[PDB]
């Protein structure tokens, strides 16, 4: 395990009390376990080795929707035209369309 | 310093689903020998297509479309060209732009 | 030009047929058979306009055969394999235990494909037409039986295929 | 942008025919039924009746 | 027990499609035309029966298909 | 369960009192349950299971 | 390839 020692930082006044320091100590990179194992608060001469558990649950929604629809329509246009002629009829509207070359 | 810090994680799946879809379309048409008849029951959607650049708005038809071009013999044999098309809008392949 | 206009691309099952018949019922034909699906792997997002990629199997053939014979116009067998190993110089070769000092990546696969065609000279009374008409009748019946007895959709189904 | 462009529901028919005087001819007709069902369930509990 | 150490994804599906046509040589009096005419009469009658007796829409419906 | 132990952070003065710390402890990711089960306030030697 | 593999059957089918 790592060794805990007392150290004095460089550039600090000599009268100031020492601080905590370490020997050779490794913090491994947790690849896919990142954010799932707490490394910030872990005591490095590790005490307490295993953790085995489960946290889970289910959620739900209720549906009771019911709808119907009917639509009826009759259109009865009528026209007159001489033989060999043409007749066009429009009952409705025009809407603007933003079209250009 | 010699050691190890490792673990495993897991997920549970129990999803199960079915789907059925049925449809029949029965268009009918009339046309004279040597004429043509077009029929469309459906709709038109606006499409932003234009020459060059990277505007102009056109319209694309969807629904049930039927086109008939018959010719009749003296024995009542029929030689025909027929186009039958059924097309619906699909949310999966639509693009928001 | 440039660097708009929107066109539409077909995917699915596509088939094109152009026959010609002889006095002996020999068929000379050009056939195009295509099966293509959307592939999420090779699609590009662009800005927000997703552009898809496709997995396709296409065959465009010109042949001639006798009446009712079966021809294969394409086929494929395609095995593939790939292995990569990283190891420590001497520890990696120790038997069994070497897997503590060595990492192995392995991939293998195979694809088989056959496309075959059969032309026949028919009329409306031929067996090939009758079987598909029978299939249509069966599909209508199944749809009718799924529905409640008093439904209006059932009446509409009863009015089709007259 | 703010230029709303609409879509339409259309029923159209463009026919070429010939008939006798005063006769009624039908140039288009349609019957179109459609149905779809989707179900999601838990593996064994979903099949219990009621 | 292996299902505690293994995950499976399964998809299956099928599509059936038929398109068929029937041509006939007709006149205005042939059965194919008559059936659609009678169908239209039935649709008009159904529309009329949905509406209340005194409505103006009902009178408009009565004035059609003359 | 996890172990609760006193720890002294690195770079901190030796006179200051110790703070709380843990042994090996897992906080699993909640996939679809995220935001529905409280993890910030949960006592880790779990008391009260269901 | 291993003796029982399907890829081995595919290889056996080629170059006929």
Q: What is the DSSP string of chain C?
A: -----------EEEEEEEEEE-TT--EEEEEEEEEEEEEEEEEE--SS--EEEEEEEEEEEEEEE-TT--EEEEEEE--EEEEEEEE-TTGGGSTTGGGGSEEEEEEEE--EEEEEE------TTSHHHHHHHHHHHHHHHHHHHHS-TT-HHHHHHHTS--
Touching, E vs B (3+ Cβ pairs under 8 A):
yes
DSSP string of G1-16?
A: --TT-HHHHHHHHS--
Measure CA C124 to chain center.
Answer: 28
User: From residue E46, how far is each of A82, C160, E40, G11 by CA, in Å?
Assistant: 36, 19, 10, 69
DSSP secondary structure code for residue C147 in this structure: S
User: How far does B8 lie from chain D, in Å, by closest CA?
Assistant: 27
DSSP strands (E only) in F1-50: 4-7, 19-22
- Residue E3 has φ and ψ, to the nearest 5°, of -70, -10
* Residue in the block written with tokens 């159209």: D12
**Measured distance CA(G1)–CA(C16) in Å, rounded:** 41
Query: Tokens representing A14?
Result: 């000599």
- The H or E element that residue E40 is part of is helix E31-50
Two tokens at D42? 């838990």
Cα–Cα distance for residue pair D38/B17, rounded to 1 Å? 8
D48 exposure class (CB count in 10 Å sphere: 0-12, 13-18, 19+): exposed
Cα distance between residue G7 and residue G13, in whole Å: 10
Question: Is E61 strand, coil or helix?
Answer: helix
Nearest by CB: C143 against B22, B47, B50: B22
Do C4 and B47 count as a contact with CB atoms less than 8 A apart?
no
> What is the C-alpha to C-alpha distance for residues B17 and E9, in angstroms, rounded to an integer?
12
Handedness of CA D36, D41, D47, D48 (dihedral sign): negative
Does D29 touch chain E if contact means CB atoms closer than 8 Å? yes
Residues of F with CB under 8 A from a CB of A: 1-3, 5, 7-15, 20-30, 32-33, 36-37, 46
B46 C-beta neighbours (distance < 10 Å), count: 16
* Structure tokens that stand for D30 in this block: 């349609």
Euclidean distance between CA atoms D5 and G2, whole angstroms:
63
Pick among B14, B22, B29, B30 to test the E interface (most E CBs inside 10 A): B30
Burial of A75 (0-12, 13-18, 19+ CB in 10 A): exposed
Task: State the residue for tokens 């018959």.
Answer: B70
Long-range contacts made by residues B85-89, C-beta under 8 angstroms, separation at least 24?
Answer: B86/B23, B86/B25, B87/B62, B87/B63, B88/B62, B88/B63, B89/B45, B89/B62
Query: Do D3 and A95 lie within an 8 Å CB cutoff?
Result: no
Beta-bridge partner residues of F30: none
Q: How far apart are CA C132 and CA E17, in angstroms?
A: 10
Judging contacts by C-beta atoms under 8 Å, the chain A residues touching residue E47 are 72, 74
Instruction: Give SS3 for D7.
Output: coil
Nearest to A101 among B6, B7, B51 (CB): B51
Residue D30 and residue B26 in contact, taking contact as beta carbons nearer than 8 Å = yes
**Residue A22 has which token pair?**
């370490």
CB F17 within 8 A of CB F33: no
Contacts of C147 in chain D (CB under 8 A): 35
Give per-residue burial for C7-18: e unless 16+ CB within 10 Å, then b.
eeeeeeeeeeee
Whether the CB-CB separation of A30 and A18 falls below 8 Å is answered with no
State which residue of chain A sits closest to B11, comparing Cα positions: A56
Backbone angles phi, psi at C12, to 5 degrees: 125, -135
Backbone φ and ψ for B5, nearest 5 degrees, come out as -145, 110
Residues of E in contact with D24 (CB under 8 A): 28, 33, 37
Cα separation, E27 vs E25, whole angstroms: 7
H/E segment holding residue F11: none
The answer to whether B50 contacts C160, with C-beta atoms less than 8 Å apart, is no
Per CB-CB distance under 8 Å, the chain C contacts of E16 are 135, 139
Contact D13, E26 (CB under 8 A): no
- Cα C35 off chain centre by: 4
Q: Which experimental approach was used here?
A: cryo-EM
Cited resolution, angstroms: 2.4
CA distance D6 to chain E (A): 28
| Distance (Å) from the alpha carbon of E20 to chain C's nearest alpha carbon | 8
**A74·E50 Cβ contact <8 A:** no
Alpha carbons D6 and B59: distance in angstroms, whole number: 10
Strand partners, C49: none
Residues of D in contact with B23 (CB under 8 A): 32-35
Tokens matching residue B76? 């009542």
CA distance A60 to A69: 29
d(CA C79, CA G14): 9
Beta bridge partners of A19: A7, F13
Q: Which of A72, A74, A76 sits opposite E50 (nearest CB)?
A: A72
Note whether D37 and C160 are within 8 A (CB): no
Distance CA A38, CA F25 (A): 6
- The partner residue sitting opposite B26, judged by closest CB among D26, D30, D39, is D30
Of all residues in chain B, the one with the smallest CA distance to A1 is: B1
Burial of A25 per CB tally in 10 Å (0-12, 13-18, 19+): middle
Q: How far apart are CA C92 and CA C151, in angstroms?
A: 73
State the nearest Cα–Cα gap between B11 and chain F, in angstroms: 9
Strand partners, C54: C38
Containing H/E element for F16?
none
Instruction: Give the contacts of D14 (CB within 8 A, at least 6 positions apart).
Output: B37, B38, B39
d(CA B95, CA C49): 6
Instruction: Report the alpha-carbon distance of residue E31 to residue A13 in Å, rounded.
Output: 112
Chain A residues with CB-CB distance to E39 below 8 A = none
Question: DSSP class of residue G11?
Answer: H
């Amino acid at each position: 395990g790592p060794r805990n020692v007392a150290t004095i930082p460089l550039g600090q006044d000599l009268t100031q009390p020492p601080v905590a320091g370490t020997g050779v100590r490794v913090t491994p990179p947790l690849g896919s376990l990142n954010g799932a194992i707490d490394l910030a608060n872990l005591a490095r001469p590790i005490a307490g080795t295993t953790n085995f558990g489960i946290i889970t649950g289910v959620l739900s929604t209720i549906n009771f929707a019911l709808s119907n629809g009917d639509a009826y329509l009759i259109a009865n246009p009528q026209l007159s035209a001489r033989s060999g002629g043409r007749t066009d009829f429009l009952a409705g509207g025009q809407v603007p369309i933003l079209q250009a070359l | 310093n010699f050691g190890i810090i490792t673990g495993v994680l897991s997920t549970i799946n129990f999803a199960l689903s079915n789907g059925d879809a049925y449809l029949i379309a029965n268009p009918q048409l009339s046309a004279r020998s040597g004429g043509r008849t077009d029929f469309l029951a459906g709709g038109q959607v606006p499409i932003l297509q234009a020459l060059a650049a990277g505007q102009n708005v056109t319209y694309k038809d969807y629904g049930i479309k039927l086109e008939f071009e018959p010719r009749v013999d003296d024995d009542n044999n029929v030689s025909m060209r027929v186009l039958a098309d059924v097309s619906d809008i699909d949310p999966a392949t639509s693009v928001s732009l | 030009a440039a660097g708009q206009n929107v066109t539409y691309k077909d995917y699915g099952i596509k088939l094109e047929f152009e026959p010609r018949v002889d006095d002996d019922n020999n068929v000379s034909m050009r056939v195009l058979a295509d099966v293509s699906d959307i592939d999420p792997a090779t699609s590009v997002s662009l800005n927000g306009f997703t552009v898809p990629g496709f997995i396709t199997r296409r065959s465009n053939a010109e042949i001639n055969v006798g009446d009712g014979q079966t021809m294969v116009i394409s086929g494929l067998v395609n095995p593939k394999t790939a292995k990569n190993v990283s190891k420590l110089p001497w520890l990696g070769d120790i038997p069994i235990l070497g897997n503590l000092f060595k990492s192995t990546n392995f991939q293998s696969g195979n694809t088989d494909l056959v496309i075959l065609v059969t032309p026949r000279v028919v009329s409306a009374a031929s067996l090939e037409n009758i079987r598909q008409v029978s299939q249509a009748v069966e599909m209508k019946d199944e749809y009718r039986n799924t529905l409640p007895k008093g439904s209006t959709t059932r009446d509409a189904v009863d009015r089709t295929l007259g």
